[PDB]
Amino acid sequence: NPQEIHLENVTEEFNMWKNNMVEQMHTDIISLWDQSLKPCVKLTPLCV
Amino acid sequence: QVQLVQSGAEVKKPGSSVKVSCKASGNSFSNHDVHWVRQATGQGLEWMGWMSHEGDKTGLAQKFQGRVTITRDSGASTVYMELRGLTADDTAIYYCLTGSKHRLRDYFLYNEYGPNYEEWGDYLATLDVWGHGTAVTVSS
Ligand SMILES: *[C@@H]1O[C@H](CO)[C@@H](O[C@@H]2O[C@H](CO)[C@@H](O[C@@H]3O[C@H](CO[C@H]4O[C@H](CO[C@H]5O[C@H](CO)[C@@H](O)[C@H](O)[C@@H]5O)[C@@H](O)[C@H](O[C@H]5O[C@H](CO)[C@@H](O)[C@H](O)[C@@H]5O)[C@@H]4O)[C@@H](O)[C@H](O[C@H]4O[C@H](CO)[C@@H](O)[C@H](O)[C@@H]4O[C@H]4O[C@H](CO)[C@@H](O)[C@H](O)[C@@H]4O)[C@@H]3O)[C@H](O)[C@H]2NC(C)=O)[C@H](O)[C@H]1NC(C)=O
Numbered sequence: 101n102p103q104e105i106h107l108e109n110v111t112e113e114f115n116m117w118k119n120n121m122v123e124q125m126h127t128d129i130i131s132l133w134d135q136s137l138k139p140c141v142k143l144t145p146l147c148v
Numbered sequence: 149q150v151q152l153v154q155s156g157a158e159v160k161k162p163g164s165s166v167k168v169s170c171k172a173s174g175n176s177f178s179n180h181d182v183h184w185v186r187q188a189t190g191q192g193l194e195w196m197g198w199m200s201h202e203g204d205k206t207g208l209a210q211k212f213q214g215r216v217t218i219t220r221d222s223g224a225s226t227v228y229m230e231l232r233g234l235t236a237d238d239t240a241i242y243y244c245l246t247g248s249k250h251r252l253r254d255y256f257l258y259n260e261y262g263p264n265y266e267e268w269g270d271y272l273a274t275l276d277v278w279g280h281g282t283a284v285t286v287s288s
Pocket residue numbers: 179180181201202247248249250251252253
């Protein structure tokens with residue numbers, strides 16, 4: 101139950117393109133990609 | 149003893165090409181080097197050229213560059229040679245002979261992650277038995 105409530109009588113500032121949650125995603129996703137990449141076979145024999 | 153066969157002798161006009169053929173019984177060219185030799189009466193042997201028994205190499209004595217080619221029938225049962233530009237001083241006994249070689253790596257680098265770098269080459273070991281030969285002469 102990922103509950104949310106509307107706040108009574110509230111407004112709030114937001115700043116798209118300033119939030120760093122996005123930046124966390126940028127490096128988290130990259131890190132994950134590499135995390136699964138790392139345990140794998142190199143193809144450098146194919147440079148022949 | 150593998151039978152060897154070669155083209156009949158031929159007279160040719162000056163300034164022009166001739167062609168010869170040879171055969172090995174049992175298709176034994178697959179196991180022997182193809183070679184061609186030239187000789188004139190009263191004169192020493194001259195190597196003309198070769199083909200590897202694998203057929204992956206060919207070559208000529210440098211005197212023949214741009215005048216000679218070597219080809220073979222599929223499955224290498226027979227071989228051929230073409231000579232070009234012949235003149236009256238090219239009259240000679242031509243030969244087809246089988247041959248042997250030693251293949252030794254000439255250089256290497258071991259690679260941990262791939263095939264070793266390698267260089268290889270061929271050294272002729274012996275001539276094998278000679279064909280009966282062909283005679284070619286040039287006249288008007
Ligand atoms: C580890 O690496 C080494 C290389 O660093 C490997 O050795 C190399 O092996 C290749 C084959 O894989 C050899 O190529 C073949 O060479 C023979 C000629 O070589 C023989 O004669 C040598 C000379 O012997 C006289 O002289 C010495 C003094 O110098 C005296 O002591 C002797 O008593 C004799 O008087 C002899 O020394 C050679 O032995 C050496 O090599 C063997 C391994 O082969 C070692 O055990 C020994 O310790 C020693 O180092 C040897 O006995 C040629 O005849 C071959 O030509 C055939 O094959 C060609 C295609 O490759 C083809 O184009 C030719 O027409 C010809 O074909 C004929 O033979 C085929 C069978 O081989 C038939 O199928 C065919 O129908 C036809 O009949 C070929 O070139 C290298 O020479 C050799 N390296 C060196 C420098 O000698 C070693 O094998 C590797 N180890 C392992 C476990 O893989």
